[PDB]
Amino acid sequence: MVNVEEIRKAQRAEGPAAILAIGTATPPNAIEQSEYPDYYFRVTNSEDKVELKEKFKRMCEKSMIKKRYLYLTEDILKENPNVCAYMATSLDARQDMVVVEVPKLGKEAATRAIKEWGQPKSKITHLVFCTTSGVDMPGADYQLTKLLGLRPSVKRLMMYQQGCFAGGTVLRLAKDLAENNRGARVLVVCSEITAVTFRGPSESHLDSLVGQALFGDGAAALIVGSDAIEGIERPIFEMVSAAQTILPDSEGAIDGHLREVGLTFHLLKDVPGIISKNIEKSLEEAFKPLGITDYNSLFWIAHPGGPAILDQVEAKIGLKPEKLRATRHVLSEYGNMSSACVLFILEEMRKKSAEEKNGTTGEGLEWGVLFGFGPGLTVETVVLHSVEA
Amino acid sequence: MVNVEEIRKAQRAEGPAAILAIGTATPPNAIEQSEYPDYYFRVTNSEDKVELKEKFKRMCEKSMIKKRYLYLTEDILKENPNVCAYMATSLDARQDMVVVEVPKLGKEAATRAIKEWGQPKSKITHLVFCTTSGVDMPGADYQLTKLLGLRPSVKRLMMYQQGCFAGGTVLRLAKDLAENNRGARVLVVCSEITAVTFRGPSESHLDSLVGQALFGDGAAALIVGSDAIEGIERPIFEMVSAAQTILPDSEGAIDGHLREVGLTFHLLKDVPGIISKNIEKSLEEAFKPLGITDYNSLFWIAHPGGPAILDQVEAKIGLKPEKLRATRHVLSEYGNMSSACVLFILEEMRKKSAEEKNGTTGEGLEWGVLFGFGPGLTVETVVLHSVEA
């Protein structure tokens, strides 16, 4: 009767997966980085710590961040004083905020992506939801499904407690979902809210302090699919390959623990040095098979974990000073939004390329690379193809 | 130069994903269910609550569970008295146990699966790790990678805080990973440790009490891959399709929150009734395309959330009394091991089928169905194809 070989050929999709739409959203309130050290040491009641404040001023001035959007307001902090301490029990209060706000912000981003896409919500077949802020059952994927009114039977993948590399991961995931399933349209959402990590300062833990200087909130959403319907859907970027690796002997370079005091962060040794030392190996594995050896001929998307990472990668690889313009722009305007960052950078890049009338969505270039960096020292490497503009 | 269309055709695999190996592992200590009511009310210092103890006795006697394996021993509870209270802050103590024990147990199962597979560990290209017990960064996937000595560059998917349906989810995930990537061999691990949910009894929360009667520990591992190398690798079950849906108007049927007191569980209304009312719709969606309408002609794997779910599905669908033998056997010998359960049942089924000299790994039958049930009231439905013996 029926053969699994024929079933398999019919159920799989045809060509490479493409990003068909992008949307972004942030909390309403942006705080200027120039103002943040005064603000932070005030609402954490740490004005006594003059030495520490001077270090944090340097951190914020060095961050190359102009502003960040933050769900956490002074009013919310007044209501939650255990969140303001370096270490006070506050996991429940932080969860109460984030289990609601993460899918809410994610919905805002998704609605925008779906608007650009222009297709009925009912055509979405898959949902990949990613966050590093909070956990619950059922998860944020379920909540977003309900908020948006997606079909029941949407195939969901809930990616919790992922960390900063996961912008690459959700792309790796959506690629396989879209390419292996003929009519698949994958909604991808990364939604990040720093209420789970915000805390007061400790002179014993300066690395936690740098986190307070860098992390901001935001959500990004994509529609990903193979075999775009002509005249109706329009690819923006196509995916070619997606890799992931653990950088050698980088054990506790970036750690995060979910405790009674919320999510703690540890950031040790030469994270910028570790990434810079190793990144060319990931470049070569990705591009040597394509016959590409000049990395300046690529359009670049890198997770802006901090400006020192970008600077040292640029110096190591010998990138022209403007290659990381898009990445530095979202670092400047949004700060480090963990997993969502890299997707904001894709949006920045295709918008700027259009306004500057480059020939393609990737700054006029054909091939590009997207990097996520995060705990494990994990690096995600996605090879992208631009589309003619 | 090179065209992405040809690259795509070369980089994807040919046939359907197959389970190539199965391994399981449990903590060393099993507690007889006949002894559990006395034990539990003793170590939680609740012997005063005679009324509640009799209720719990009814629960354990009704559970159709003979024993469970438990990482938590009386010695560990004595060292962690805040875990024994119904409500005491204890998340840190539970995380400390589970962030270590979950990948440790997973490694045991994985080593067993790899032994059966018989191929070098270095041939593993992907790792899907699933747990509902604890979260950390980097995750249990990173830890398992380090424990097993997998290649860096193994492509990892860390599935946290998933719940009891996730045995289905990891199959759904591994299917797309294996089928979309030509040489891919996917290590799948589900590892579940109930130290995160163990707590004392409360007459105000009887639904928490049923969890104390049902949940046990365990880990299961699979190797999944397409295009098995003939004479070297041996498919056990092949995957045909994988679906996921949210049962209508089942809102708070199964909830779990991760709080300062650990993981709390809420289990409301007629979970068995909700599942039974809706399950034929998932059967029909899965099997109508294959021309199959007699659900007794399938080999069955169902998540044993409780014996009432099994009994009511059986009655509703009109299943022969022996169809759920394999599922009921692992319920009896292991209890409810959340996401790992369904994988233990696959192992039971193919082992029993072999010892009974049935014509196939699925009790002599060609087609089968695997169900995962969990929060959202989510049901995962996987269509399986057995292999000749």
Author numbering:
A (entry chain B), B (entry chain A): 1 to 389
Article passage:
CHS, the best studied plants-specific type III ployketide synthase, catalyses the first committed step of the branch of the phenylpropanoid pathway which leads to the synthesis of flavonoids. Enzymes of the CHS superfamily share high similarity in their amino acid sequence, structure and general catalytic principles and function as a homodimer (monomer size about 43 kDa) which contains the conserved Cys-His-Asn catalytic triad in the buried active sites. Furthermore, a previous study also showed that the reaction catalyzed by CHS can be seen as a three-step reaction which involves transfering the p-coumaroyl moiety to the active site residue Cys164, decarboxylation of malonyl-CoA to an acetyl-CoA carbanion and extending the polyketide intermediate.
In conclusion, we have successfully isolated FhCHS1, a CHS gene from Freesia hybrida, and examined its biological function in flavonoid biosynthesis. The gene has one intron with an open reading frame of 1,170 bp encoding 389 amino acid residues with a calculated molecular mass of 42.58 kDa and an isoelectric point of 5.74. Additionally, the malonyl-CoA binding motif (marked with yellow background) and a highly conserved CHS signature sequence (marked with red background) were also found in the FhCHS1 sequence. As shown in Fig. 2B&C, the crystallographic symmetry of FhCHS1 is a dimer of dimer, with the homodimer as the biological functional unit. This indicates that FhCHS1 has a typical CHS enzymatic function, catalyzing the conversion of p-coumaroyl-CoA and malonyl-CoA substrates to naringenin chalcone.
